Amino acid sequence: SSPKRPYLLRAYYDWLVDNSFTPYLVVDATYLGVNVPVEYVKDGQIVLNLSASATGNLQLTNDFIQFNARFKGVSRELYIPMGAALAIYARENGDGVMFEPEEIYD
């Protein structure tokens, strides 16, 4: 059956937003297919602000996360395969979850 990760991710995103937290996503920028600004990658990882105000056309689908965001005032489109989403947490207090490894992703 399908991976649980995208469902847990959307569920946690909603919990975070409903509690007034800013949703931060930790991404493995080395994962095949990840398309993000390389200059912001630190040790092969990048943390992205997924709040409504900081993103444009946010999509949290089963296979990927996609949206527009500004980096130094320049709007850019990011594409993150679901297998590259490692965890999601509140910027304010670190509460959230790290997704469990799922065979289909590796």
- Smallest Cα–Cα separation from 31: which of 59, 63, 67, 77? 63
Q: Tell me how many residues contact Mg ion (CB under 5 A).
A: 1
Where on the chain is the footprint of a copy of itself (CB under 8 A)? 1-2, 4, 7-8, 10-12, 14-15, 18-19, 21, 95
Cβ proximity to a copy of itself, 2 vs 57, nearer residue: 2
61 is written with which tokens?
């689908």
Alpha-carbon span 83 to 75, nearest angstrom? 24
Task: Return the ∠ at Cα 76 (arms to 13 and 91), rounded to 5°.
Answer: 30
Select from Mg ion, a copy of itself, none the partner in contact with residue 95, using the beta carbon and a kind-dependent cut-off of 5 to 8 Å: a copy of itself
The count of C-alpha atoms lying within 13 angstroms of the C-alpha of 96, restricted to the half-sphere facing its C-beta, is: 25
Partner interacting with residue 30 (select from Mg ion, a copy of itself, none; CB below 5-8 Å by kind)? none
Minimum distance from CB of 26 to Mg ion (Å)?
A: 20
Strand arrangement of the beta sheet that strand 23-28 belongs to: 45-49, 23-28, 85-90, 96-98
Query: Between residue 51 and residue 90, which ones bind Mg ion under the rule CB under 5 A?
Result: 52
Task: Select the binding partner of residue 11 from Mg ion, a copy of itself, none (C-beta < 5 to 8 A, by kind).
Answer: a copy of itself
Which residues contribute to the site for Mg ion (CB under 5 A)?
52
